[PDB]
Amino acid sequence: MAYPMQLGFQDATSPIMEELLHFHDHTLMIVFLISSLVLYIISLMLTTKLTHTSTMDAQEVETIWTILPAIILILIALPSLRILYMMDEINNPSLTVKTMGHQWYWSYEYTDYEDLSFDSYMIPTSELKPGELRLLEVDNRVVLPMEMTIRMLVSSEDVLHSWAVPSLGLKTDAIPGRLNQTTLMSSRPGLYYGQCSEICGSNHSFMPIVLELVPLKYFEKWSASML
Amino acid sequence: QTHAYHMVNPSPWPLTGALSALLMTSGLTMWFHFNSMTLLMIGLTTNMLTMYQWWRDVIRESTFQGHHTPAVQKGLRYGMILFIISEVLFFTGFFWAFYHSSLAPTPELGGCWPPTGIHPLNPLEVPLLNTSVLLASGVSITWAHHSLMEGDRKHMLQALFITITLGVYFTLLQASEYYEAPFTISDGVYGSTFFVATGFHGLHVIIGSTFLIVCFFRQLKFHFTSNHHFGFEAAAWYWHFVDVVWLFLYVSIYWWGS
Amino acid sequence: MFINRWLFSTNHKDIGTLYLLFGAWAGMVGTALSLLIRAELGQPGTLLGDDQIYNVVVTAHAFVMIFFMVMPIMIGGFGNWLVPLMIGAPDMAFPRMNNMSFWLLPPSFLLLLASSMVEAGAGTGWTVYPPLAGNLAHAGASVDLTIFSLHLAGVSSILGAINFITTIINMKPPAMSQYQTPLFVWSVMITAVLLLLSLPVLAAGITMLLTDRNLNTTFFDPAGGGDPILYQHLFWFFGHPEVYILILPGFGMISHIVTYYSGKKEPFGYMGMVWAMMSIGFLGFIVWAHHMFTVGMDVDTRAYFTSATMIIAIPTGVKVFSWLATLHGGNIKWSPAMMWALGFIFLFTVGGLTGIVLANSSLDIVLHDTYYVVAHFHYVLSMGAVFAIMGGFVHWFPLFSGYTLNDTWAKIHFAIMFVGVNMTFFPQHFLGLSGMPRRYSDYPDAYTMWNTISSMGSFISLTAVMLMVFIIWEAFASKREVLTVDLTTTNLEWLNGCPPPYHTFEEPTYVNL
Amino acid sequence: GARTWRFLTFGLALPSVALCTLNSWLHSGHRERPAFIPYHHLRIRTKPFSWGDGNHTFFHNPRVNPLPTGYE
Amino acid sequence: GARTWRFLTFGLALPSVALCTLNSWLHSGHRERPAFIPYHHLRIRTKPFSWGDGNHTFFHNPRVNPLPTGYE
Amino acid sequence: YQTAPFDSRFPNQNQTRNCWQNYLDFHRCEKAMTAKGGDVSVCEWYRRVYKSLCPISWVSTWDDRRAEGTFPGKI
Amino acid sequence: YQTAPFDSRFPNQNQTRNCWQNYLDFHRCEKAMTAKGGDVSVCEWYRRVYKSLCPISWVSTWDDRRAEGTFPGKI
Amino acid sequence: FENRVAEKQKLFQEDNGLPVHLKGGATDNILYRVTMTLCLGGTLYSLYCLGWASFP
Amino acid sequence: YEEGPGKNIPFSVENKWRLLAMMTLFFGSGFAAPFFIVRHQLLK
Ligand code: HEA
Ligand code: HEA
Ligand SMILES: CCCCC/C=C/C/C=C/C/C=C/C/C=C\CCCC(=O)O[C@H](COC(=O)CCCCCCCCCCCCCCCCC)COP(=O)(O)OCCN
Ligand SMILES: CCCCC/C=C\C/C=C/C/C=C\C/C=C\CCCC(=O)O[C@H](COC(=O)CCCCCCCCCCCCCCCCC)COP(=O)(O)OCCN
Ligand SMILES: CCCCCC/C=C\CCCCCCCCCC(=O)O[C@H](COC(=O)CCCCCCCCCCCCCCC)COP(=O)(O)OC[C@@H](O)CO
Ligand SMILES: CCCCCCCCCCO[C@@H]1O[C@H](CO)[C@@H](O[C@H]2O[C@H](CO)[C@@H](O)[C@H](O)[C@H]2O)[C@H](O)[C@H]1O
Ligand SMILES: CCCCCCCCCCO[C@@H]1O[C@H](CO)[C@@H](O[C@H]2O[C@H](CO)[C@@H](O)[C@H](O)[C@H]2O)[C@H](O)[C@H]1O
Ligand SMILES: C[C@H](CCC(=O)O)[C@H]1CC[C@H]2[C@@H]3[C@H](O)C[C@@H]4C[C@H](O)CC[C@]4(C)[C@H]3C[C@H](O)[C@]12C
Ligand code: CUA
Ligand SMILES: [O-][O-]
Numbered sequence A: 001m002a003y004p005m006q007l008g009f010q011d012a013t014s015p016i017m018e019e020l021l022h023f024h025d026h027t028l029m030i031v032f033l034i035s036s037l038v039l040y041i042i043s044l045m046l047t048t049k050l051t052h053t054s055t056m057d058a059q060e061v062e063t064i065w066t067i068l069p070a071i072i073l074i075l076i077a078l079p080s081l082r083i084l085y086m087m088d089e090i091n092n093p094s095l096t097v098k099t100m101g102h103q104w105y106w107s108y109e110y111t112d113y114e115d116l117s118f119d120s121y122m123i124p125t126s127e128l129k130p131g132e133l134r135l136l137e138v139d140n141r142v143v144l145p146m147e148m149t150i151r152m153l154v155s156s157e158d159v160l161h162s163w164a165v166p167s168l169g170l171k172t173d174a175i176p177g178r179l180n181q182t183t184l185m186s187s188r189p190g191l192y193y194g195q196c197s198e199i200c201g202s203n204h205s206f207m208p209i210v211l212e213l214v215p216l217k218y219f220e221k222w223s224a225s226m227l
Numbered sequence B: 001q002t003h004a005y006h007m008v009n010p011s012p013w014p015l016t017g018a019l020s021a022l023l024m025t026s027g028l029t030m031w032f033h034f035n036s037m038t039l040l041m042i043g044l045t046t047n048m049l050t051m052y053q054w055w056r057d058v059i060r061e062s063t064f065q066g067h068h069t070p071a072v073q074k075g076l077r078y079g080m081i082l083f084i085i086s087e088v089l090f091f092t093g094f095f096w097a098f099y100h101s102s103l104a105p106t107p108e109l110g111g112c113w114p115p116t117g118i119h120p121l122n123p124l125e126v127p128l129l130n131t132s133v134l135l136a137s138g139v140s141i142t143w144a145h146h147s148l149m150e151g152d153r154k155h156m157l158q159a160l161f162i163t164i165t166l167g168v169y170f171t172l173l174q175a176s177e178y179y180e181a182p183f184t185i186s187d188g189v190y191g192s193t194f195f196v197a198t199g200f201h202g203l204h205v206i207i208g209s210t211f212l213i214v215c216f217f218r219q220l221k222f223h224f225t226s227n228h229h230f231g232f233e234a235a236a237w238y239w240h241f242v243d244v245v246w247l248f249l250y251v252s253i254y255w256w257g258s
Numbered sequence C: 001m002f003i004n005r006w007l008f009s010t011n012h013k014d015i016g017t018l019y020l021l022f023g024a025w026a027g028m029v030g031t032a033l034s035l036l037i038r039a040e041l042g043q044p045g046t047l048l049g050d051d052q053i054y055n056v057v058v059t060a061h062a063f064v065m066i067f068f069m070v071m072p073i074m075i076g077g078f079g080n081w082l083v084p085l086m087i088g089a090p091d092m093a094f095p096r097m098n099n100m101s102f103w104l105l106p107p108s109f110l111l112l113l114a115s116s117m118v119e120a121g122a123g124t125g126w127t128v129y130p131p132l133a134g135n136l137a138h139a140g141a142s143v144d145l146t147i148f149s150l151h152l153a154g155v156s157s158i159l160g161a162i163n164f165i166t167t168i169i170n171m172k173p174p175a176m177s178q179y180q181t182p183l184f185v186w187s188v189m190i191t192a193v194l195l196l197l198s199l200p201v202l203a204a205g206i207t208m209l210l211t212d213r214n215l216n217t218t219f220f221d222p223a224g225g226g227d228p229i230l231y232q233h234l235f236w237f238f239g240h241p242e243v244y245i246l247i248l249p250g251f252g253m254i255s256h257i258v259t260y261y262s263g264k265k266e267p268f269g270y271m272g273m274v275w276a277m278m279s280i281g282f283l284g285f286i287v288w289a290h291h292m293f294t295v296g297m298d299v300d301t302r303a304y305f306t307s308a309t310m311i312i313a314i315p316t317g318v319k320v321f322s323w324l325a326t327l328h329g330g331n332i333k334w335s336p337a338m339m340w341a342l343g344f345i346f347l348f349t350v351g352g353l354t355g356i357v358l359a360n361s362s363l364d365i366v367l368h369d370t371y372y373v374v375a376h377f378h379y380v381l382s383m384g385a386v387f388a389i390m391g392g393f394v395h396w397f398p399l400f401s402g403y404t405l406n407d408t409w410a411k412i413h414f415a416i417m418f419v420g421v422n423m424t425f426f427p428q429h430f431l432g433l434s435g436m437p438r439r440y441s442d443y444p445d446a447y448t449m450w451n452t453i454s455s456m457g458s459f460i461s462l463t464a465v466m467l468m469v470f471i472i473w474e475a476f477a478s479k480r481e482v483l484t485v486d487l488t489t490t491n492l493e494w495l496n497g498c499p500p501p502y503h504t505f506e507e508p509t510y511v512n513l
Numbered sequence D, E: 001g002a003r004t005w006r007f008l009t010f011g012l013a014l015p016s017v018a019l020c021t022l023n024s025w026l027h028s029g030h031r032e033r034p035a036f037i038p039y040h041h042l043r044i045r046t047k048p049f050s051w052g053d054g055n056h057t058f059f060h061n062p063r064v065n066p067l068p069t070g071y072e
Numbered sequence F, G: 001y002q003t004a005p006f007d008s009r010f011p012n013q014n015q016t017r018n019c020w021q022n023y024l025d026f027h028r029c030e031k032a033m034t035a036k037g038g039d040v041s042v043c044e045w046y047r048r049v050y051k052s053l054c055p056i057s058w059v060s061t062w063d064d065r066r067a068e069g070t071f072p073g074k075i
Numbered sequence H: 001f002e003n004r005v006a007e008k009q010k011l012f013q014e015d016n017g018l019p020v021h022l023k024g025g026a027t028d029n030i031l032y033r034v035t036m037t038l039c040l041g042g043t044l045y046s047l048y049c050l051g052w053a054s055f056p
Numbered sequence I: 001y002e003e004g005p006g007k008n009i010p011f012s013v014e015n016k017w018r019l020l021a022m023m024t025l026f027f028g029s030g031f032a033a034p035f036f037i038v039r040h041q042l043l044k
């Protein structure tokens, strides 16, 4: 989850999120450098009483102005597209889980073996247990095996929603009549939080996502106990 | 003035037109949600009054007052071309909707096009007749144009009358096909795409036929010269646009989509 | 006389004046909406109600700022006032149709304010996606009134685009080629081409939404074989060009202001600036699905939209560097308009660069539907489009009115607005990276500090808006009449005096070959 | 010239319309309506129509257009 | 005018070619050749070719064009 | 069987047709097997894949439509 | 069973695809039934139809190509 | 029919200061008043309808 | 029509205090409207 006064991304929980952090660092350096160079050049143009107001020849300088940006875009696109295709690569999941968006809660279906499904609603502020997070806790968490490739399938039974978990690098739109696929792999046990990421009416702010990442044996016994 | 451009007399029709748009939209709202047609009928009436008086004034300014210099006519040429382009892009949205639905038919349809339970019209029956009618009208309007340029009043009138008769024939055939169709606008995305796309086209055929009828009465009244007749050129361009949209509908919805 | 002049106008200047008044009123509405947003978010918890009232405010904020403030001011106001004067034309090609473009906007605005008064409003976002915008999740008149609002604003701008393209092509002096027209005139012609092609596709899409809501069509309804994602394609096919429509006339005004207050006769690299605007206009039609990177499209499609979107940085960079090259060697006048234009160059660059971050589909997975997007677009709109409007307003107010502003007050106004917009939007980057979603009435407790600071910024911007009204009052109250304007040899719009007569160029300019 | 476009109008275009009018004429006559099946992707009703009883399409033909509950 | 068509040549057409050239030169790497299967509808020989040994196509590439009997 | 493997026919984020195809394949196979009075256990692979991929409400709606006579796919 | 009945999928003088489809259908069914170890009698309708319609030389060529691994249809 | 355009040219060029939308004579004033009355009355009715629809 | 400074506008600037009232009502009504619309929505 986010912490107070946070400036950047939540710490990476998955390898792809790790990749996105390093790609963002590279891109941000470029954004900083270009922003800085423009501000510095403005301040340089504006700090001399020397003048030259006759017609200026443009073509030589326009080579620099187009080539250097073209090279910089290529230096962004290359790692950008490497990560794009890495997330798309075939991985062989061990487990498929479905989530259905609703106004205003998530349902989960684990139907590889048994008919396991349940609803996941926000804990009201007045019912939080001491130490629990306002607007982020759910009654029924999405328990999942850690260190395993999981296929998540996302849809809706009403309006658009979007199923997001920032620390895993995940955001998949929940569209009625459509089954969208993403893959999830947590390097660590723990609790990983997200929030509905498509405007879906009165309680859009109040239908969060909580993943609970535990060893396979714990996930198996939990699954059995939830039938 | 020592330029060739038209300084237009202050006019109330922009305001009456803007207000007719408010009354038509608020009227449709009142019809869809508050079970009443009153605002809508006031808006349609004021819209027709506005169009009548505005285009009447354009005839006064041109035929009767002489404000349509070559420079003014050139501007109207560009204006009509640009208007037709905007209408092309409007239809493009409906063609996009059609191809989107038909190229990737969803499970609700049976995963096929046409959908399960949809019995398309035979494209070789009335749809082919409608194609022949609009193509024929493209030929007769070209005859009318050449007659007018050659200074032939009688043949201009006969060709333009034939063109209007074919536009009316198409409209009556389409009305009858709408009535006979075993599918409706509520028959899923097939009915949706079919009736909204062909329906907007039908509306454009009525608009174009109305424009040609306006040219017919202006011709009867000797308004057009052998060299100056922009209202006729504009109606002819609009009429070709309507023909070409039909050819795309016929190939896309009626033939390829059957 | 008053009715004939102001309700029955066929005069480009008076119609430009009507647009500027309309846009100014709209800007006060959009400002109030922005303060309600930031009041709701300025402390954790609920101030107004649940997400419905909140998103009615957010939705109306966007429509008002885009359709009733920026487009009317840039295109209807500056375009009508300046385009004919800059080409020595006696009016627009279709001076009566011009008046209907204006008078369609009050009714458009009335339908939007009706949407918000009936039922529970249209809490849809300005994108109006189904099925939330459909007849189940938004039963009743609100969304239909929004659709009709968009239809009237659509017709207004389509007829306006036909008028500008025709005027700019057909009504220049016969010796003047298109490569002898000022950059602002180019910026309006290109904007008009974008409007002509994009708005009809929006019209088709919102018409499909109207029929799904009222005539039992199923374009966007899977039960009938429809697809909610089809609406998104049609909307964004319009929506990406729309953002280029919002900035292009700002680019044109920036070129004029930088040239003028640098004491130059011409912008650096005129043909490069023409090339850049045409390139941006063209590329702006082939990138729309960068608004859809999370909907589930194929990887190769995501790769194409990433690449095509990044290409826009090249022509945009030529313009930024050409503005810097125009300043280079200038006799710089530190006018209030120059301050707006220099703020534009820097802050537009920052928002353009956060747009290049978002163009990366892989990173956009985590940034999409977060405040990072909100930060990007407010840098380019609230510090780009708005700075160009404020620069153009203070630069040309004496042409339009015949009176001067108090330059000291105008510099105060600039300083306050500069602090407020940065305090408002800079921290939203942090909220985005750290995962705060869009269209939320309330946030997890961790996001409190940056939301608090952002809301405090919004109040500083309110102070600047209030001062601006006072500054316009002070100019009309004091009546300092313009005497001499420098650089008329390269700024034709000033050469008929301040204000120019009702009829200008009755005798056209003499230009030989 | 006018002469050529008249030749095309009467020699090619109207004969085509006459032949297609014949073709349609010969293939007219009511074909037998299909068995009613209450498919959920057809006869959509999310909101009553703003005319009649709310349940009839605008150019409703009793012979060939079933209601959601079947033929009238 | 010539000025406009030159503007399109250098401002749109050649930039397009440069970008397609970049696109192509990024996917120019040799792909993995597929297993040979002696399909009867491929590697047709009804008459020997009028060059070489009669069994090689005109722009035969040993790396990617198998003979009727397989890769050389 | 853990879960449905990668299927090169359905390699993209939209998995709707994968669910649909496997549901069709199971019910076509079941009809072919019940008809000649053969064994529905040969159909088991299609059954496991559609149960893994398909939302419960989709299967539930499709089953109701097969019983009603309103299922629009060919079985 | 006397002979292959009229099939509305193949209503025209060109019956090539009728022969091909029933040949594929038979061999796809026989592979599915051998595969779970199920029973090929289930496939009998397709066997009778293709045997009725298909030239012996077509069946013999296709059989040889299946054994060679050069059959171009998907079984 | 006969060509009476010259007589309409004389009427519409008459030096009487009328705007083109009123220059045909008294019938133009009537149709103008009908149009503007329906527009302004219709607009006032649309505002009444908003007032009504703004409450449950 | 009147030409020149203060005459090419649909509002009078003859009296700066009447102008202040008119401008107050004009910009003030625009800024107020959303607060009164929210009040309206809250009171249903
Ligand atoms: C004026 C308005 C405006 C403008 C001009 C832009 C310009 C750009 N925008 Fe933006 N955008 C919006 C308004 C605008 N945008 C809005 C309103 C939304 C949200 C819509 C919604 O969901 O409501 C949005 C959303 C949006 C998204 C979707 C994000 C998401 O929802 O997840 C993306 C994705 O690529 C995008 C990218 C860009 C880019 C690449 C540009 C480029 O045109 C920027 C180019 C400029 C530069 C790059 C800077 C100058 C260049 C240089 C100094 C040269 C050197 C530079 C390099 C080498 C990089 N913007
Ligand atoms: C032009 C477009 C534009 C402008 C200027 C602004 C300006 C502001 N915007 Fe907004 N905003 C949007 C377009 C704009 N916005 C859009 C498109 C959305 C997305 C909507 C959605 O999600 O569906 C949005 C969403 C949005 C959000 C996100 C809401 C959410 O996700 O829940 C927030 C949050 O703080 C915000 C705040 C502000 C603030 C505080 C200002 C302040 O900076 C405003 C300050 C005031 C001004 C800048 C003055 C304006 C007036 C004039 C310029 C008149 C001038 C007069 C003359 C020239 C005579 N806006
Ligand atoms: C690089 C850009 C394109 C270059 C064009 C061709 C170059 C050489 C030949 C010139 C003539 C071309 C015309 C078309 C005729 C037939 C084949 C040409 C197409 C070609 O060049 O195809 C090649 C085969 O050429 C072959 O067989 C052999 C080809 C040579 C013999 C052709 C003899 C036939 C001539 C027929 C003439 C008829 C003229 C008609 C007149 C009409 C008048 C009424 C393809 O190579 P491949 O190894 O199979 O596959 C590639 C594997 N790596
Ligand atoms: C012979 C062809 C001529 C068409 C004339 C017919 C009707 C009136 C108006 C037509 C305008 C065209 C398109 C509007 C949308 C829908 C109508 C489609 C065509 C049509 O007429 O469709 C009919 C349904 O009409 C219905 O619902 C009718 C619904 C009537 C109300 C229409 C609502 C208006 C929509 C608003 C338009 C917005 C415009 C946008 C402008 C762009 C601005 C930027 C089909 O009948 P059916 O019984 O379902 O099936 C036949 C079964 N026997
Ligand atoms: C039941 C349906 C109801 C819906 C409403 C629409 C219904 C009907 C509208 C029919 C359009 C009729 C247009 C008549 C225009 C007459 C005026 C005219 O044609 O004016 C001519 C100029 O053209 C000009 O302005 C050209 C002006 C062109 C305008 C034509 C535009 C088509 C309009 C479509 C409008 C709605 C479409 C939207 C659909 C979604 C005058 O110049 P000339 O001809 O050279 O004459 C001069 C010579 O005599 C000198 O010797
Ligand atoms: C020049 C201006 C002066 C004249 C002002 C105009 C006066 C018009 C008032 C009549 O109001 C109408 O009353 C009908 C019945 O009361 C309504 O039909 C409604 O009710 C009908 C049957 O009762 C239904 O069949 C229709 O579907 C339905 O829209 C109709 O909509 C509505 O317009
Ligand atoms: C130039 C000036 C402009 C003219 C303005 C005209 C305003 C007067 C219109 C009359 O008002 C009518 O009142 C009827 C009440 O009797 C309504 O009937 C409709 O609403 C009824 C209310 O029960 C229902 O019976 C039906 O839906 C239907 O008859 C109908 O909506 C409405 O038009
Ligand atoms: C007699 C009259 C003369 C027109 C004139 O020169 O003033 C003629 C010339 C062309 C005639 C029209 C055209 O011949 C075409 C139509 C033919 C139909 O048989 C009658 C109506 C019809 C629409 C004709 C009406 C009328 O008789 C017209 C208008
Ligand atoms: Cu669910 Cu937002
Ligand atoms: O829209 O960027």
Ligand SMILES: [Cu+2]
Residues within 6 Å of the ligand: C239, C240, C243, C287, C288, C290, C291
């Ligand atoms: Cu975009």
Ligand SMILES: [Mg+2]
Residues within 6 Å of the ligand: A162, A197, A198, C294, C368, C369
């Ligand atoms: Mg989204």
Ligand code: NA
Residues within 6 Å of the ligand: C040, C041, C042, C043, C044, C045, C046, C047, C441, C442, C443
């Ligand atoms: Na809040």
